[PDB]
Amino acid sequence: KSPEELKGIFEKYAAKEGDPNQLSKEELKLLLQTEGPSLLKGMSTLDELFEELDKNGDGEVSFEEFQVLVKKISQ
Secondary structure: OHHHHHHHHHHHHHHHOOOOOEEEHHHHHHHHHHHHHHHOOOOOHHHHHHHHHHHHOOOEEEHHHHHHHHHHHHO
16 A cells, blocks of 8 residues: 555656656655545654654655655654
8 A cells, every 4th residue: 555655646746856766855745644644644653754854854765765764664
């Protein structure tokens, strides 16, 4: 579920940033939060750690990196 939902949205958002594999924090947050309304699986661990990464200032996030990070920090 979450992989597919995240990815499906990610492709569309990432298209704005040209490379469908690459998204950034700004969109990332929206994309994560979406799993809230969708599956009640957005605005928790995922966004919390991504806010930390935002404060560190990662900014740019590839799908793969994103995906592995969110599930690894959650589990």
